[PDB]
C-alpha cells in the first residue's frame, strides 16, 4: 500500500506514535516519506547482505528475521515481511521499540539526513487527524 500523507499520519497517531519518545507526529511523517515513500512494501538490500523492510525501512541485521542474514538478530521477535502489510501495526510496534533503544530517531538514516532539525510540523500541516 501507497499511503497518503495525511492518511499516514493519522494511522500513525492511532498506533500512538505522536510524541512518543518525544518525537512528534511530523517526524515520524517525514522519516517514512525519505525512508519509503510511503509505500508498505519497499525493500532495499544493504552492502552487509542485511535487508531494510517496509515503511520504516527496518533493518533484518538487528530487528525481524528474514532467513538470509546470518548471525543477525531478531529484536522485534517478527518475520520481517510482516513488516510489508498494509496494515502498519507490526512496523509501529518494532519502532516502538528501536527508538527506545537509547539513540532515539538517528537509528532511521534517512530521518538524520534530511528530516532531524528541519519544520517537520510541515509533513502534518493540513491534516485532519
Ligand atoms: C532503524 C533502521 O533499521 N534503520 C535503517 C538502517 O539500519 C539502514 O542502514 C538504512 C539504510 O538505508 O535504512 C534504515 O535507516
Ligand atoms: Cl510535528
Ligand atoms: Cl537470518
Ligand atoms: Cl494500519
Ligand atoms: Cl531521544
Ligand atoms: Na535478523
Known sequence: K???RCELAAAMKRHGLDNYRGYSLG???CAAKFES???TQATNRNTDGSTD???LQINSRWWCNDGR????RNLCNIPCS???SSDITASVNC???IVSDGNGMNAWVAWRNRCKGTDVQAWIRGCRL
Do not use: D, E, M, R
Open 2 to 4: 501507497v499511503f497518503g
Open 27 to 29: 517526524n515520524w511523517v
Open 37 to 39: 515513500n510511503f509505500n
Open 53 to 55: 523492510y517496509g515503511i
Open 69 to 72: 542474514t546470518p548471525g543477525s
Open 82 to 84: 510482516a513488516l510489508l
Open 95 to 97: 519502532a516502538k521499540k
